[PDB]
Design a protein around this ligand. Sequence first.
Ligand SMILES: Cc1cc2nc3c(=O)[nH]c(=O)nc-3n(C[C@H](O)[C@H](O)[C@H](O)COP(=O)(O)O)c2cc1C
Ligand SMILES: Cc1cc2nc3c(=O)[nH]c(=O)nc-3n(C[C@H](O)[C@H](O)[C@H](O)COP(=O)(O)O)c2cc1C
Lengths: 361, 361
Amino acid sequence: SALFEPYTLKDVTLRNRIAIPPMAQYMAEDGMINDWHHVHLAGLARGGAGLLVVEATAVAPEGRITPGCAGIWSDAHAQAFVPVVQAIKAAGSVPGIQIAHAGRKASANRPWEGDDHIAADDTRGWETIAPSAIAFGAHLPKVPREMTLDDIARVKQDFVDAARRARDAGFEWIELHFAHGYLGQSFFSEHSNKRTDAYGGSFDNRSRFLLETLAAVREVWPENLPLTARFGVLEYDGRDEQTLEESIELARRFKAGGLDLLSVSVGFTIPDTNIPWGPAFMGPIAERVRREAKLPVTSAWGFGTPQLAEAALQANQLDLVSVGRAHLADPHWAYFAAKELGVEKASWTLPAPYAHWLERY
Amino acid sequence: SALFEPYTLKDVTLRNRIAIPPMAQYMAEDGMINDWHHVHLAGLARGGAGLLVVEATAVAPEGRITPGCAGIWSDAHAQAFVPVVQAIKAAGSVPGIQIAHAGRKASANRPWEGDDHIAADDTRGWETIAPSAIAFGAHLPKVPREMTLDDIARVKQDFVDAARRARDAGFEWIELHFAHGYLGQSFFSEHSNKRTDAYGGSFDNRSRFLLETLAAVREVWPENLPLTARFGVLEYDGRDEQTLEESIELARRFKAGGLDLLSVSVGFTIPDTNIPWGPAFMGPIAERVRREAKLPVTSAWGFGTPQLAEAALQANQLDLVSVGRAHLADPHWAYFAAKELGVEKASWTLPAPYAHWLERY
Ligand SMILES: Cc1cc2nc3c(=O)[nH]c(=O)nc-3n(C[C@H](O)[C@H](O)[C@H](O)COP(=O)(O)O)c2cc1C
Ligand SMILES: Cc1cc2nc3c(=O)[nH]c(=O)nc-3n(C[C@H](O)[C@H](O)[C@H](O)COP(=O)(O)O)c2cc1C
């Protein structure tokens, strides 16, 4: 099976091609993770996936999506990850982390607590920042504050400090969250970036925040550990061919700037779009980015059907398959997939205290 | 669904009828549990089962099955359970523990490390104790030492101390391990108990260790928390009708002595038997014990098919359904079962950070 072949990137080897993508848990307090995250993550690592990417972790308090988001904006925040990292490694999975800044989509309620911007008089909320003072709209109506150049410098440095902290906590894989309409994606998109300084207008200017952040992170992140990003390459907004072309060009610049793999997603920059949801619908777009930028990729959405994950790898649409919700349903999805795809000794996808009893079960 | 109806016993209410039976992990060191157990147990509790019974936990070092068995023979051993108990409760499951003494089956290798008695010159091994100096045979050839009356007094007191420790660690449910050919089962069975003192010969004498242990435990275990035992009620050794009759009589004495529920099993006292394995094969025998002793019961073996669990409850064969290996395969089995049985809002069997995303998934 292609799904169960190892993958090496820089000095890191994944035992198979199953990646658990970042999935926000909304269970942290003042950015500090706790035993929710410890058990959730260690349990996933034991399920067999080759790579486990920790949820969007804010580089600064105002860059959380919600009051429940994880943060890494102080050394004490970083040190809370150390035991979790150590547990993921003990289980044989590679520990990764997505570092993030939610931009105009920040200061929102948890998804099961309204999913909308927090009310102005709610003591939990805060002012959001973005390239331009333009609201997302719909359930996220707050107009963000337009960033100053000093704000841009500060947020870049927050990404650097977050990457340095992630390194020192023992993570072996980092992902810059430049997707899903958050700060980085919103600098790239003409929908959200109306700046007239060096950080908006042209393709080079809209790319600038993302490229400078990548380069600044690269100074502290070890050259021998994968340096990755997640990026929305189209919006399904009626501008797809033009947007894809620019996004692929940026992917080429990321590669030239030391990016090892791109997690290919949709932008979600604005609400007025028509996304053609379906199982593995991202496969063809990820394949095009992979081919045209000559860069390894992962993608997600509906790969919890093991045969679809297998087909995507065999077609060279993807290098890793990211499987999200199926891992919430069943932390041991990798074992399920191994059985489905007829892997020999499938139960030994799991550790011995499980595997021994499930042999031919 | 019957499977998803709550159950109250003494002051404890289980949110559904799914019990996770004790399942040895073989991951402790000198009896001390560690982050293996913490994550394993907290993850199971979050999967939705109403009751989670911690694995066979030795009341004394020589009562471990193997060098990897959990123990509770000192206060430091007990205190290692406190954070795990607290995590199980946080997840809404009832924390239970099975306290145990492996008797003649002690001093064995882990199941994936030979599964047999440890060699005489292996520094990990130890002398086993039992009612009589008679080996199990087959892969457990060691002849145990015949217990003195002082040994019997000491082991009873070890059970008392273990129950007191379990209480003080915050467990809400206790199970005495009188099944599976370990010490208690071996006092009851004429195959293994050839004593000619007050602890062997007659039905009353063979029952005596089990009844005295129960009564001594009852002095320290709170009257408002379920007091349970696991007991093998037949052997499939060609003596089933006679053995069942005696076992049911002992179950009546257990009930009279304050036992709240009996986990009904097979004896496994000797190797030369013919067990008719099949899905839910224990259902009819558990039903007979339930009816003839007028005592609530659980049983196990093949109830990971949700419809079978449901049918057993609806037929009043069982009060709780114990589901073991299916929970090793999938810690979230309860969610799978809820979907299968058509429970409304099945995903909310899980906590919010999972349930929200799996609604209609
Ligand atoms: C609970 C949940 C939280 C998510 N949080 C993040 C996140 O922190 N960062 C991110 O880039 N994507 C996030 N996503 C998107 C997932 O990484 C993934 O792309 C998506 O769930 C599609 O894959 P699936 O169909 O396998 O679930 C989240 C998705 C879910 C279900
Ligand atoms: C990994 C494993 C360890 C077990 N350890 C114990 C134990 O500690 N105590 C006990 O009484 N039974 C033990 N058992 C038996 C289980 O509690 C249960 O009765 C059996 O697995 C049948 O249920 P199932 O078909 O749902 O797995 C163990 C079973 C397994 C698979």
